């Protein structure tokens, strides 16, 4: 008669690594790395993302005429921009401190567009001929919808003195611009006055822009340039414009109604008609694992990203052949 001491074995083929030995077969193990995603852009926690499609953030905010889809967008969870959107600045130029603005958007979930300087209140200037073939719409020449490209009326451009007071409770994103013409002839042709400026003031801002003339290569058929600027106008503060010519005046500006968690996600994927708790630029994640290896830039309640191909913990013991 005998009694023996021994231990469990089973049909497991699960393997784990240790420092001294790789591919040790064990009776039980626990994978802790999520390796799969659904391959789609999805609603975060019910709240749909802003999918800019072929538009950029600039094209959206300035109101590029090819971006009418986003003329009034509801609140978003996150934003999705392509690596190289085709509908950026239709009329060539620059967006000043663009990257700092996009960073500002990572803390914003909802804008409310409102009118601050009506297009039909420019009685001393022509305000309906501020268009170009570089910004087409339905076959006709158009322009960034949110700003007014003002020109001379009956061969005069008198000084503009316009002020807007932020009586709203919410911070306000104000956009405007300056036009750089091809040469001296174009300057007088549009604005009459040969030497001009745009002065902009708030409680913090003290700006004075002057147009830089230069012979420039054509970009979308234009030698001229548009340089766009912005500020955040705080509650009870007023913005003050004075100009001599070359002024691209604000028409619409965005109220910042909701601030919170957001992100601009760079991706070529489109909307997935889909819902998730954790989103990445190449698809959504749905698992209880503590780790994943899909992509470092995620939003939501996510596992921690690691670069591993494999993380498996031993729970049971060494299995017998």
């Amino acid at each position: 008669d005998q009694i023996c001491i021994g231990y469990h074995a089973n049909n497991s083929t699960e393997q784990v690594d240790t420092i001294m030995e790789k591919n040790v077969t064990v009776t039980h193990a626990q994978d802790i790395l999520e390796k799969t995603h659904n391959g789609k852009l999805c609603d975060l926690d019910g709240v749909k993302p802003l999918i800019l499609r072929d538009c950029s953030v600039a094209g959206w905010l300035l109101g590029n005429p090819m971006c009418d889809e986003f003329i009034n967008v509801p609140e978003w969870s996150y934003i999705v921009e392509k690596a190289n959107p085709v509908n950026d600045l239709c009329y060539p130029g620059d967006f000043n401190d663009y990257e700092e603005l996009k960073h500002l958007l990572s803390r914003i979930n909802h804008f409310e567009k409102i009118q601050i300087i009506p297009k039909s209140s420019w009685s001393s200037h022509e305000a309906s001929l501020g268009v170009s073939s570089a910004c087409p719409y339905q076959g006709k020449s158009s322009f960034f919808r949110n700003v007014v490209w003002l020109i001379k009326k009956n061969s005069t451009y008198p000084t503009i003195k316009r002020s807007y007071n932020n009586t709203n409770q919410e911070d306000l994103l104000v956009l405007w611009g300056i036009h750089h013409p091809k040469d001296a002839a174009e300057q007088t042709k549009l604005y009459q006055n040969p030497t001009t400026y745009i002065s902009v003031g708030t409680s913090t801002l003290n700006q004075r822009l002057v147009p830089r003339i230069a012979t420039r290569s054509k970009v979308n058929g234009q030698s001229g340039r548009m340089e766009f600027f912005w500020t955040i106008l705080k509650p009870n503060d007023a913005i003050n414009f004075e100009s001599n010519g070359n002024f691209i005046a604000p028409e619409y500006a965005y109220k910042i109604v909701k601030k919170g968690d957001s992100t601009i996600m760079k991706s070529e994927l489109e909307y997935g008609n889909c819902n998730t708790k954790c989103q990445t630029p190449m698809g959504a994640i749905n698992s209880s694992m503590p780790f994943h290896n899909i992509h470092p830039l995620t939003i939501g309640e996510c596992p921690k990203y690691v670069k591993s191909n494999r993380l498996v913990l031993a729970t049971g013991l060494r299995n017998s052949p």
Partner: protein, 162 residues
């Protein structure tokens, strides 16, 4: 393994022991069979479960990357941003993979230790009333029926009785 039992002096595991990680196999005139040692098995479950949660929990607070965009004349800071994000990823990847390797080694050794301690526990009861065969088994000098066998698993094997 470090403790010499698993795949050591006990050559292999038992497909036949389904109800626990460690246990006993008995063999006498009445029959034979397996019985799991509940106490040491549950000890192992608790230690390994706590470990897994400890591992997960320690990796709870960890670097999260954020999107930052830079223009064409901000290449230096763009590169700094890139090196920083990547640097932390590599550090946390390293931490994760090393923790798994190290703790996997300790988990296998832990099981080996629990088998060794169970074996010794029985050895210290039986003393010289049985032959230590050298393969995990003890051959009795007296006849050991199922009640006898049960007292070995109990911890109450009455050595003065035999």
């Amino acid at each position: 393994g470090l403790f010499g039992a698993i795949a050591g002096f006990i050559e292999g595991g038992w497909q036949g022991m389904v109800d626990g990680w460690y246990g006993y196999h008995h063999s006498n005139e009445q029959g034979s069979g397996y019985a799991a040692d509940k106490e040491s098995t549950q000890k192992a479950i608790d230690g390994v479960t706590n470990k897994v949660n400890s591992i997960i929990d320690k990796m709870n607070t960890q670097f999260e990357a954020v999107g930052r965009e830079f223009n064409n004349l901000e290449r230096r800071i763009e590169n700094l941003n890139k090196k920083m994000e990547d640097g932390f990823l590599d550090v946390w990847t390293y931490n994760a993979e090393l923790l798994v390797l190290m703790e996997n080694e300790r988990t296998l050794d832990f099981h080996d230790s629990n088998v060794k301690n169970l074996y010794d526990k029985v050895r210290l009861q039986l003393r010289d009333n049985a032959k230590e065969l050298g393969n995990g088994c003890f051959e009795f000098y007296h006849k050991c029926d199922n009640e006898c066998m049960e007292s070995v698993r109990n911890g109450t094997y009455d050595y003065p009785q035999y």
